[PDB]
DNA sequence: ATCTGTACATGTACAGAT
DNA sequence: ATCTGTACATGTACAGAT
DNA sequence: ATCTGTACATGTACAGAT
DNA sequence: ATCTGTACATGTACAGAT
């Protein structure tokens, strides 16, 4: 019971999955063909599906989809922004119209990308779909879809580089004692990605490891058979779902928590999965203890004001410059409260 | 243990590895380039290193290397040869036209041209002392005999590469689901399969690339034998068993029918029967070797050792190995087992 | 002038050597 | 314990080709 | 270059078994 | 209550064709 029943509630319905995906795939496919069918500065982008729905940890409803349109760009030089670790300027075609002083401007290229999508969305007459107003500094072009429910799709332009990952990641991805050195070496043989976030704030990109995280979510055990048809279930994803849910419920209720996001939870459980690598440490019979030790770890992160980017160890997602101490102390109070009272926020609608 | 000292004996020396590999890689590279010449039928053939040396289970000396020269052959149809599971006929200005006889790609015609080219190229090698061994009938290999002073064999194996789905005779093979798992199994079966020459148009399936992967990714835990994981004794047990057979085989001509692939197949089944890394703790080397010996003896006595990839192919069937050959090896193994392995002290 | 099969450049798991 | 040679995967440079 | 075909992973859904 | 077996559904890798 208890947490088992909560997970029963969070579980997506097969029918809703079917109806959401088919409408999502209609729009995405149409947008994707537009990007190459034309001259178009983004001819050659490929679709990369990412985030919780494609990692099978989406909760409640299939109402948010994350898609990367990635562009392979060769002979790119990276300059780390302000020792931040995650933010870079990039330098040396149709992309000529996006540079400046030899700097590929994230802002300029996102704007044309965005302009294309808006135009194509205008030609869609079979689906009720609009482009959400732009959020400054965001990497996303966000679609809002109606019909069987509200659905949002974040279309994320990404650059794809095939060289060695930037030195700031050298000490990241510390999976050696959990997924192992062969897996780590192979993952770092994959490309890395750059996403037009902006900390020259307008020209900066941010590193993305959404492809690495997806692999990890679907290949998460120390045993190769974890959660496979001839292995045993673990409760790793279910703990992620529960913690995601506690934060979503807390964020709905308290504006004091706007600065928090699900990626903070994702980052925290990557660290917990590294600290507790054995699959037996995530036995489904120990769901409550597992959820609790995740809570305690997350609270220790808040208390110490320290949650390092799992791929970029020096980039503290909980630094003062990013999240006010007051916000972190508010979230500590609310989590400790739910914890010490049987999670009442889990009962509510 | 006694067995740890045997393993020290069996361990290859780096100095020997260097000298052997340097010469082997010179000859192989030159043979691969000549294959890409002109109107050579084998142009586009690619190199695949296989077998015990590339699996790090070669014992005693680095004196036998296995290398496949693989040729992608698109658009092919296979006919299983008489329900044997492992043997096939292959059918379709193509450069393999000279090897056809009405739809059918002749194995020995292709192997013979392959061989002729190799022999010719070896004649032009004066860098080092290397000759081509007399052909063994029905063998897929062209064997090089290198004297580096020390003697080194190189089996060069012509291979057809097909990228379609594996033949149905393997549908139930590779039973690694409780051990390496379903994702690993699916991904391995997405790789190509291989046909090597074995009546004269018969080819044989090869899974040397899959076996190589398994050898180097052999644990249920991803960290098995890794620098942040725990050592197992799976490969060490393979080495000891290979050594038992090699010592016996160089002493007793009665054992000519047996080869090391029998030992490699038996321990794949053992690795399937005991998937947990803790059933191969280095502290239990003796038990682990002993249970392998016992499994092998039961295969001998019951006359049943299924091909790991082709379940219906029995490597210990009557048609391949006489019951007396099996009973002879059984006695010799049982003898070594119950007398402290005196053949391990030999030489 | 650009294109490209061939081979160099880089990085590291494995396992022998010290 | 760290150091180190071979094998091998992938990214890239460029003589020689087009 | 783009697209379908095949195979089976990952899921949800529910009845019958335990 | 949970487990197991079948049915149902989407996502994804890659072969082969055009
Ligand atoms: C895939 N999607 C991404 C990535 N980064 C951002 N997104 C999408 O873009 C949305 C907004 O990105 P955020 O990182 O939140 O950036 P922001 O909104 O400008 O800044 P915040 O206030 O931190 O939310 C995310 O919720 C994702 O849906 C990525 O690396 N891969
Ligand atoms: C790589 N090398 C192979 C393969 N098959 C055979 N070889 C090499 O070629 C040698 C001869 O193969 P065998 O199976 O012994 O052929 P054979 O001796 O004619 O037939 P048998 O009497 O059954 O031994 C082997 O010892 C290997 O070195 C293969 O599938 N992959
Ligand atoms: N600040 C960030 N830094 C790096 N990558 C991020 C960041 N925020 C999001 N991402 C990446 O983008 C993906 C999609 O983000 P999103 O906000 O939709 O979360 P999610 O993982 O899909 O979960 P959910 O949608 O269920 O809240 C994340 O899974 C992660 O890979
Ligand atoms: N009878 C066979 N059937 C199928 N594949 C075989 C057979 N014999 C050998 N092979 C394959 O060819 C490879 C090379 O064969 P080889 O006889 O050299 O043995 P090995 O595994 O390299 O060991 P060693 O050379 O130390 O005896 C094997 O590893 C196996 O994959
Ligand atoms: Mg999301
Ligand atoms: Mg060999
Ligand atoms: Zn699991
Ligand atoms: Zn091991």
Author numbering:
A (entry chain C): 148 to 239, 246 to 352, 358 to 507
B (entry chain A): 148 to 239, 245 to 350, 359 to 507
Could you give the paper's own sentences about this structure?
Cyclic GMP-AMP (cGAMP) synthase (cGAS) is essential for the host defense against cytosolic double-stranded (ds)DNA arising from various maladies (e.g., pathogen invasion, ionizing irradiation, and genotoxic chemicals). Upon directly binding to and dimerizing on dsDNA, cGAS cyclizes ATP and GTP into 2′−5′/3′−5′-linked cGAMP, a unique metazoan second messenger for initiating type-I interferon (IFN-I)-mediated inflammatory responses. cGAS is central to antitumor immunity, host defense against an array of pathogens, and regulating autoimmunity. Here, we resolve these numerous fundamental mechanistic questions in innate immunology and present a unifying catalytic mechanism of cGAS. Finally, we reveal how mouse cGAS achieves more stringent substrate selectivity and higher catalytic efficiency than the human enzyme. Together, we set forth a unifying catalytic mechanism of cGAS in which dsDNA-binding pre-organizes the active site into a rigid yet adaptable lock for two sets of keys (substrates and intermediate) necessary to specifically synthesize 2′−5/3′−5′-cGAMP.
To test functional implications, we soaked QN-mcGAScat•dsDNA with inosine triphosphate (ITP)/GTP or ATP/ITP. Moreover, the ATP/ITP-soaked structure suggested that ATP and ITP are bound at Site-1 and Site-2, respectively; the carboxyl oxygen of ITP appeared to accept a H-bond from Ser366 as seen from GTP, and ATP fails to bind stably at Site-2 in all known structures (see also below for the pppGpA-bound structure). These results support the idea that the -NH2 of GTP is disfavored at Site-1 while the -NH2 of ATP at Site-1 provides a favorable interaction for site-specific ATP/GTP binding. E, F QN-mcGAScat•dsDNA bound to ITP/GTP (E) and ATP/ITP (F).
